[PDB]
Amino acid sequence: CPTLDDTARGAYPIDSSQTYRIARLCLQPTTFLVKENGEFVPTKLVTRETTSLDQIQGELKVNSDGSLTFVEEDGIDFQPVTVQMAGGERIPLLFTVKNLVASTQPNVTSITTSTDFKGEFNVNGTKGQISLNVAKVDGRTGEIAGTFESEQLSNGHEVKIQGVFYASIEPA
């Protein structure tokens, strides 16, 4: 995924007379954890191709309480991944945010480093929750970056995925 300019600073104002969209959301996983003996334990990523979800996009609605809701409407939102447990078992996983709907706190008059998106996704047998923690905003360009954590069920396993994200916001 892309990154922000070294001089990126500020907040991205939200004009409540305008409508907005996420033009691109890119999720790059850094960590896959699988539950074993009741504990989430780390695994080794063995897939050598790209594991990122990218081109995710959709309307960013301004709600009556001032919160924003992102509705995923298109994107590459599904990547097959294989991870390896310490003892050697290989587990095929599905990394996805298909049908994501995620919302911020109320009264979000700008996007700032304390804005969060929290939501749920679900595709066939995979259902999950994700939190996007914004860490840096370029108020000039509408680019944001941060970290994410997702929890899901994939092929009979409880899985936690962490990583970094980039997104681009623009008017409609």
Ligand SMILES: [Ca+2]
């Ligand atoms: Ca933050």
